[PDB]
Amino acid sequence: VPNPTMPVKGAGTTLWVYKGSGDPYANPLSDVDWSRLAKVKDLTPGELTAESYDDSYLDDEDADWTATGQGQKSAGDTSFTLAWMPGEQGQQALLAWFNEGDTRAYKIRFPNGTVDVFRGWVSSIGKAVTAKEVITRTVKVTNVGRPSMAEDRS
Amino acid sequence: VPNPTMPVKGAGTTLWVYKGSGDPYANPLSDVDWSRLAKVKDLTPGELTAESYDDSYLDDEDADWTATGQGQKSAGDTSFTLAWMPGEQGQQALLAWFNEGDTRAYKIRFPNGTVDVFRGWVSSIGKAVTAKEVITRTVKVTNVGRPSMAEDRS
Amino acid sequence: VPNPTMPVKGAGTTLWVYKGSGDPYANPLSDVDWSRLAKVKDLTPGELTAESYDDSYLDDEDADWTATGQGQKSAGDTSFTLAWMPGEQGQQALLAWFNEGDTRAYKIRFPNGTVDVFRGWVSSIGKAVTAKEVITRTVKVTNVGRPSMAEDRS
Amino acid sequence: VPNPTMPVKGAGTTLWVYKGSGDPYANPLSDVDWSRLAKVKDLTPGELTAESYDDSYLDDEDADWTATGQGQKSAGDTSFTLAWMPGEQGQQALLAWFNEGDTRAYKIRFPNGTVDVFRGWVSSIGKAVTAKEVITRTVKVTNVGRPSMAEDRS
Amino acid sequence: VPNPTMPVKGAGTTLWVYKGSGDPYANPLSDVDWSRLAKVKDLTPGELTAESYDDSYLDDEDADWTATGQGQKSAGDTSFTLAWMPGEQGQQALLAWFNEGDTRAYKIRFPNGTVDVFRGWVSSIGKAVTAKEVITRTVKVTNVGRPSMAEDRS
Amino acid sequence: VPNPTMPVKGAGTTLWVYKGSGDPYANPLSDVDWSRLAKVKDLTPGELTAESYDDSYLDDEDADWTATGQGQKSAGDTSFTLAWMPGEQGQQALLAWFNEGDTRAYKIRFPNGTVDVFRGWVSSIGKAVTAKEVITRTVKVTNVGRPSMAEDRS
Amino acid sequence: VPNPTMPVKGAGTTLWVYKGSGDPYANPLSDVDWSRLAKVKDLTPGELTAESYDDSYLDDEDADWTATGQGQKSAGDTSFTLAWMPGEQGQQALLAWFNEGDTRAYKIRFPNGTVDVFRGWVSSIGKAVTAKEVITRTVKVTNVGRPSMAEDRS
Amino acid sequence: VPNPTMPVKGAGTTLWVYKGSGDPYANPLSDVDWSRLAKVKDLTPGELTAESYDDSYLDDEDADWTATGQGQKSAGDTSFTLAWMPGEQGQQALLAWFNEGDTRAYKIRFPNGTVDVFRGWVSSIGKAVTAKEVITRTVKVTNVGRPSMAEDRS
Amino acid sequence: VPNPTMPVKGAGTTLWVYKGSGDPYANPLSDVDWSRLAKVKDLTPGELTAESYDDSYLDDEDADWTATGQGQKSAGDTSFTLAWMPGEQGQQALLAWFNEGDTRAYKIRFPNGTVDVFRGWVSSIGKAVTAKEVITRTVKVTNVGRPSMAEDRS
Amino acid sequence: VPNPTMPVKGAGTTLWVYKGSGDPYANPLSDVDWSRLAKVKDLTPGELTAESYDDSYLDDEDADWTATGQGQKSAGDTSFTLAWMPGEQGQQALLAWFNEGDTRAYKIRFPNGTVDVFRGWVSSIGKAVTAKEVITRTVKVTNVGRPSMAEDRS
Amino acid sequence: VPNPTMPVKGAGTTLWVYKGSGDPYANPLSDVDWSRLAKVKDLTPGELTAESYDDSYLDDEDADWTATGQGQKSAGDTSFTLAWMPGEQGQQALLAWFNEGDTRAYKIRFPNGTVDVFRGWVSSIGKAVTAKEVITRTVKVTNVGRPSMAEDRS
Amino acid sequence: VPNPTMPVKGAGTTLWVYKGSGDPYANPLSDVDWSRLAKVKDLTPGELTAESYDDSYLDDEDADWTATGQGQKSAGDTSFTLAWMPGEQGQQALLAWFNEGDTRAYKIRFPNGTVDVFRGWVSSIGKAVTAKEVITRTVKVTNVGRPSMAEDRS
């Protein structure tokens, strides 16, 4: 039985792409109108980050130690590699996404029972060919706006 | 039997270079008037990519999180290393391609049954000499314009 | 029995986050009004540092050797990785800390019997997903002001 | 029997330096008036390369994908390491070549039966001393002008 | 029996820090008024260095080969890592040294029988926490002025 | 019997420093008035090098391939590491050389039977301390002017 | 919550233009009858200034140091650049303003919660066209009379 | 689909020059009898401006603050640089325009779907010659009379 | 401890404006009846200067070299930029100072322990708005009469 | 093959000076009786220009917008820098041209296949001396009369 | 040992100001009755200059080339910046010098062993305040009459 | 071997000053009675130039294009910077030249093998002092009359 409180191993994660019209953040737990990408081999989700903003004046009584405040936050790049299946409707959606410069919403569903939703556009579409290994399609997606992390809902 | 839906191993890929007059994108599956480069030993196809365009104004109410949109897409470099056979027609075509700065169309044919076509010019011509190994000719080709990915056709 | 004089092994370290209103530096040994982050796997405490300030004049009789003085000190970044438990209260506190840009005080309690207090804001919130390993939450916290090292109290 | 069509292993390569007056490119297959460097232990021939020249205008109807053309070609550096024999005539010729800044023609004769001619000047002259290994002299030669690759003659 | 002429192994080196008023360079061999840092686990002493000053004119007959002269000498950084014992006097002296920027004199005493004295201020104070290893305190000290090498006294 | 024509292993090399007044290049083979540094563990002699000087005009009929000529040659840095013996004469000479910014001549005598002479000034004086290894003194010397390589004499 | 006492970052500023009949200075805080310019990318508000008026007589007892008084004050030029949207009612108002030489009142509304009102006429209407950037309309407005600065109201 | 309300990127702009007899302002959207200049590489359209007319009397009660009104409006200079093709019809038209001092009507057609018309005479004709770049023809045109901005038509 | 003899760093400077009736120069060390401007980011104090007065006659025996004497001294402009807080009393005092043309006395109190007093009137009041930076108020004040430099009191 | 219609790169330009008696404009394509300047390193051809002539009257019904007409055209200055070869005949011709104030015709022959003829007199003759660069002679030539641009002949 | 014939580096220069009654030029080498300014951080000595006097008549046969003769020589300005120490005697002397206009003699003493004397009056007194840098006092002094260069005495 | 026909690098130039009685232009190649300035670091020789003289009449049939003729030629300023050696004869000669307003002849001798002679008087004598650089003496000389350029002799 899935349990948010206890740790969970990573095997079982799925990746989804939104198609349709509506609010992706409204009800991420249901899968109606969410297309799926199958056979993902690697997945490194985006890394939220922030910039230091220098908060110092000449008036300040003491200047021995620095003082800074948080600046402009920004979600990073979410990159995954998945096996090459050009006839699947899923990968045709990826290249239609790339060619038509657009921002859609993609979802990560962990075995924990939680859901993680981002919005972004695709930045790279690569491939690797080796004699004795499956042909892989590597994708990197750049996020915009505010992600809806998993522990907002509780 | 080739099947686009299922994954495929990489062994069996071929590389072809176009000679003649016509439309390379019109009918890549046909093999007429396509010269072939033989005995490739490595192949890393080009990586499509795009650069971010900053979309922010002073008016916008929310400025905590960054907002960006897709910019100018560009295919990358395709580099392959193939055994040195200076008397073969294909490699003389390669150096004729390099000396006379020109853009031609080269094709990658996967065991999957699909076809991948690019257009570009050659950027590097190298060599490696070792006592106990076959002399290899390393080539890097820079693409221009819009590639024709294999999954456009379906 | 804990002993500040003798060396100590690292196992037993704990991490805490301050909640409430008061003076964090006043009495850190008490554990009231301090929330705790559980199941930390790695921890690298911040690195205090300073930058050189050039102290030279044309008058100086001797200029063969350089002469410098200490400049502006600054505590560094504290980064720890801890197992992903989105339903636990501590990690919801972490993301509330991140979303609302703010500076709080976090505490490190060593097995030695001493306490190390910092003040800072959170800079990065990341995650790593692998098939056969526990999903981890990686955090980096940037410090401001003057830390209260353990060596002050004695 | 040497065969340009089939692949060949690297053992048997020789290095030569032109002395005399004439046209090096006219007839490289002959071995008269070509001094030889003996006992070479590594050799990496130069890498021909070119740089991109941006070909874009504001008029262009389509600017989604980049468009570039080939720029200025340039042969690279040829570097080889050969055992230190200061009393041999070839290495005295090398240092006379270095001290008097000048461009000569050096030749690489592969076991394949073909010949590769370059023109250039010497850039580095180094040495390595180790207790249990032969003292080596390392050379790097920078090319100018147009090389005469082996694939021209056929 | 210690002997400067013959080589010596490194085990047995000690590190000392000066407290009091006087001339550190006057009599470093005496051990009075020199506090000691105990249980060091690594030590890389500073590296004296100098920067080139370009000495060339337009008049000079020969300009094929470069000509330079020595510039401004400067001792480097001395960094050592020692086990964390916050209750010991030496490490409280270290943090008092760091907080109040100041230049003091520290001494390295080799098993050879010689003494090495520097003057400088502290630049970094770090820590490393691991589950199965002793907690270590890493210090880096930046020197100023002229060091008193051991090779002066003889 | 030493032989310049044939290769030689590196063991047996010696390093010398000139003291006195005269011409170092006049008679390097004689060993009078040449002080010696003993017990050297590593030695990497300097690397002669040159700068490319761009030789191109707008008039030139062809500009497809680059054309360059040799620029300003310069001997590099000669660095060696030798065991720490502060009571020996040679190393006191090294520190007297470093403190008094000066250019002297140092000699390398190979087992081949040849001699290599440089002129230069010292740039670094470092040390390494390890628990179970001999204390080593590392020196780097920067050369000026024209070296007298070994195969000038024949 | 907006607070005049504390500093505020600049993001969120809006620009407005008055249409109708009434007193612009009477009630700037309400937005009835105030048209808005949207998507402003840069904004540098006007710089109030004054002229020195020479106050000196021959009678004056001392003339060693100058003495001056304030002259005729004048608000400067307020210039902003906003993205080109010729179909918006807002930008048509700008060009109707320019063609019909007139003085109207424009308003700046800061995130602080305050309001800044000027009166003036337009001096420049420019444009910038770049291949990969949004077309921008640059405007400069020259002010007349007395501005109603933000801290008049309190 | 072109849309005046939304912002547009600059790529796709065209420049046209009128030939024939009629009213340029009557129907600029139609493309008949408008010659075209091809391959523009830069374009900075003219900047409308006005000069202040001093409106102050001695009678006025208030003279602390300046008061001015708009004077004589005047379109500025329009300068574009386009690749040198002396055999094309457009550039021969340019030099015929320059030699015979005359005022014609030139049109700028944006990707937005709008049209901008000016009237003026040519002021400069320049050229730039570089070894590795396309020879460019730089033109500056001075406008007279009243321009017809694109947003008059709606 | 403050010390006029030794050099001092700039952090800790304060700016004050005189309100009330009395003699500003009489006792500036006291802080009563002096309003304060808070949060100053930059400060460039005025530059005392003088202009040359030509002292030459036709009689002078020697006229090869020029001869001049000092003319009329004049303090310059003091300009500081401070964060925009329109609800604070100090900045309302600044704009009341500007609107009513008047000369008051403002004071600079250095960390050294000394005081620098000027008298003057305000010349410029400006502002700068940026998306990611604090809104700043820039002021310039022009001095009259004789300043009371800190070096007078001792 | 040269083609006036298509763009061309600049490499291959030549500079010529007319000697003899005849009509320079009659047949510039021929190369007889035209001396040549060799080894030019930069060349910026003259910039044709004209000045505005104010065309306004008090009668004019409308005076809101300015109205001007073209004035007196004038070719600008042609400046080129070429390597210093005082023994060559061309540069002796240049200085004879300068010393005897006179107007001759100089020609620019582009790689395009066209010819550009001017007439003018020389204004500046300069030189630049640097230690590691070729001595250059810089010339500026001022044109008179009507140039014969390449676009006339077709 | 100081040596006028050989070049010297700048470090070690001192600046002195004369107090007392006598002849400054009589014996500048002696240091009695010369006050000293301490801790200078920059120094750019004055630049002697002269202005051309036009020497041409209508009679002269040759008027192609200009002819001029030297006019009125004049020493320039000497400006130095030195650390702000208002309690030191030298800087109180500086402001006493400024307030009471007066010409005194100041001396520059180079490490070369020579002495440079000027006479002049002070023109500017400035200051720079920065958060992390030493407060500096910038002075500019204008010379009168004839300087006594160091090259006179020999 | 020096060669006037071919280009030459700048290193090796010398600067000379004439002392004695005779004709400087008669035999510049001989080096007798020519004093020398040593250790010059920079040298920019004078720039010959001319003034436009307007040649236009009302009678002229055409006035569309300007017509001008050469006016009064004039050699410019020759400036060089050389290291400060006040005890050397040449620099005492420079200051004797400056103090006694006079015109002498100075010579530039290029590595090409040619000679360049000017006549003029000195205009500036400056100096630059830096902590870590050689003290430099900067001189600017203004020329009169007719220079004797290098390619007059052939």
Residue numbers in the entry:
A (entry chain G), B (entry chain L), C (entry chain H), D (entry chain K), E (entry chain I), F (entry chain J), ...: 3 to 156
The authors write:
The temperate phage lambda, which infects the bacterium Escherichia coli, belongs to Siphoviridae. The virion of the lambda phage comprises an icosahedral head and a long flexible tail. The tail, which comprises the tail tube and tail tip, connects with the head through the neck. The neck–tail complex comprises a channel formed by stacked 12-fold and hexameric rings and a 3-fold symmetrical tip.
